[PDB]
Design an enzyme around this catalytic site. Structure first.
Site, PDB file in Angstrom:
ATOM      1  N   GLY A  14       0.798  -1.214   0.000  1.00 54.23           N
ATOM      2  CA  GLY A  14       0.000   0.000   0.000  1.00 54.23           C
ATOM      3  C   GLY A  14       0.835   1.269   0.000  1.00 54.23           C
ATOM      4  CB  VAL A  21       3.270  -0.728   3.769  1.00 54.57           C
ATOM      5  CG1 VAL A  21       3.466  -2.106   4.423  1.00 54.57           C
ATOM      6  CG2 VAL A  21       3.020   0.314   4.853  1.00 54.57           C
ATOM      7  CE  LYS A  36       3.207   3.678   8.273  1.00 53.79           C
ATOM      8  NZ  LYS A  36       2.352   3.876   9.454  1.00 53.79           N
ATOM      9  CG  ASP A 121      -7.926   6.685  11.164  1.00 56.52           C
ATOM     10  OD1 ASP A 121      -9.143   6.925  10.960  1.00 56.52           O
ATOM     11  OD2 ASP A 121      -7.074   6.692  10.244  1.00 56.52           O
TER      12      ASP A 121
HETATM   13  O1  LIG Z   1       1.892   0.403  10.806  1.00 54.63           O
HETATM   14  C1  LIG Z   1       1.346   0.434   9.680  1.00 54.63           C
HETATM   15  O2  LIG Z   1       0.963   1.494   9.146  1.00 54.63           O
HETATM   16  C2  LIG Z   1       1.148  -0.838   8.923  1.00 54.63           C
HETATM   17  C3  LIG Z   1       1.422  -2.079   9.495  1.00 54.63           C
HETATM   18  C4  LIG Z   1       1.251  -3.241   8.750  1.00 54.63           C
HETATM   19  C5  LIG Z   1       0.814  -3.160   7.436  1.00 54.63           C
HETATM   20  C6  LIG Z   1       0.539  -4.379   6.640  1.00 54.63           C
HETATM   21  C7  LIG Z   1       0.981  -5.640   7.029  1.00 54.63           C
HETATM   22  N1  LIG Z   1       0.650  -6.708   6.306  1.00 54.63           N
HETATM   23  C8  LIG Z   1      -0.123  -6.589   5.229  1.00 54.63           C
HETATM   24  C9  LIG Z   1      -0.588  -5.339   4.827  1.00 54.63           C
HETATM   25  C10 LIG Z   1      -1.505  -5.201   3.672  1.00 54.63           C
HETATM   26  C11 LIG Z   1      -2.316  -4.060   3.587  1.00 54.63           C
HETATM   27  C12 LIG Z   1      -3.223  -3.903   2.538  1.00 54.63           C
HETATM   28  C13 LIG Z   1      -3.335  -4.906   1.576  1.00 54.63           C
HETATM   29  C14 LIG Z   1      -2.545  -6.055   1.683  1.00 54.63           C
HETATM   30  O3  LIG Z   1      -2.635  -7.057   0.762  1.00 54.63           O
HETATM   31  C15 LIG Z   1      -1.646  -6.212   2.729  1.00 54.63           C
HETATM   32  N2  LIG Z   1      -0.265  -4.249   5.558  1.00 54.63           N
HETATM   33  C16 LIG Z   1       0.503  -1.921   6.881  1.00 54.63           C
HETATM   34  C17 LIG Z   1       0.696  -0.766   7.616  1.00 54.63           C
END
Ligand SMILES: O=C(O)c1ccc(-c2cncc(-c3cccc(O)c3)n2)cc1
Length: 271
Positions: A14, A21, A36, A121
């Site tokens: 994302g 990330v 991240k 959030d």
């Molecule tokens: O701390 C954060 O902002 C954060 C932590 C973990 C993730 C994370 C960890 N694992 C998978 C995904 C993810 C997020 C969206 C779609 C997808 O296929 C996977 N996102 C994202 C942001």
């Protein structure tokens, strides 16, 4: 072991405001983590709060490393993606799935609140699923301490996402943290059960919010929701945060305790 500290970045999970990330895989072990990446050209507080977090329904923080002006947070990889994508527009999901996800959300939120942290959030985009469909609260970029040395601090910063924010955050200069997260969980529950958000925002000028306060539950999204979970939502989406149901009482709710879902389908045979 040579090379164990090398991670290949293999896929974008994302883009965001902060940056991006990535799915990272260890060269040696093939362990996957989310990385991240935030361009500092705010994050110290997110890291600090992340260092406090250890719960099965909260995204695990592994550590961080800075290389110039780029911070790299190493976080639990959640292969199931976002809860958002398990919600079918206009439909929701099967009630037993929603109940289970709601159970896990409360567990995470109880934990956070118990260590004096408010997420601020909570929404389906931030609730991630691991390979076993276990829910994990993610993204502590807006999070803050509301209790320290057993002394509550009232919040005054408006933040979150309008359709999920509690009405007091729009009406009052100061408010308690915990009822705000409870409210957002209620909106998430509504979304899971109806596949739509009840209002743009919980204000006196929003007709759909007015309709809810007038108990017009013969309208959408409420007409899609069975009476038992709807009775819970009536207790959560209460305008007065002091009269709003608390989590201990959510855990006592009838729908909350209703047997709905068989355990995860394990293998079996017959003779
Ligand atoms: O701390 C954060 O902002 C954060 C932590 C973990 C993730 C994370 C960890 N694992 C998978 C995904 C993810 C997020 C969206 C779609 C997808 O296929 C996977 N996102 C994202 C942001």
């Amino acid at each position: 072991v040579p090379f164990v500290e090398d991670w290949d970045l293999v896929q974008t999970l994302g883009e965001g405001a902060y940056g991006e990330v990535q799915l990272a895989v260890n060269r040696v072990t093939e362990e996957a983590v989310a990385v991240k990446i935030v361009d500092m050209k705010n994050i110290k507080k997110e890291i600090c709060i992340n260092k406090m977090l250890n719960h099965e329904n909260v995204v695990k923080f592994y550590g961080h490393r800075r290389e110039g002006n780029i911070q790299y947070l190493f976080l639990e990889y959640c292969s199931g993606g976002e809860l958002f994508d398990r919600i079918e527009p206009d439909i929701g999901m099967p009630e037993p799935d929603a109940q289970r996800f709601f159970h896990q959300l409360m567990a995470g939120v109880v934990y956070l609140h118990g260590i004096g942290i408010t997420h601020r959030d909570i929404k389906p985009e931030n609730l991630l699923l691991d390979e076993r469909d276990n829910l994990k609260i993610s993204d502590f970029g807006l999070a803050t301490v509301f209790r320290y040395n057993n002394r509550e601090r009232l919040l005054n910063k408006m933040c979150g996402t309008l359709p999920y924010v509690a009405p007091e955050l729009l009406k009052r200069r100061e408010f308690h943290a915990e009822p705000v997260d409870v409210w957002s969980c209620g909106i998430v529950l509504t979304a899971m059960l109806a596949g739509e958000l009840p209002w743009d925002q919980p204000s006196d000028s929003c007709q759909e919010y007015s309709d809810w306060k007038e108990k017009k539950t013969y309208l959408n999204p409420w007409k899609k929701i069975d009476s038992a979970p709807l009775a819970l939502l009536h207790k959560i989406l209460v305008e007065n945060p002091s009269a709003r149901i608390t989590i201990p009482d959510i855990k006592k709710d009838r729908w909350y305790n209703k047997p709905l879902k068989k355990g995860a389908k394990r293998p079996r045979v017959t003779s």
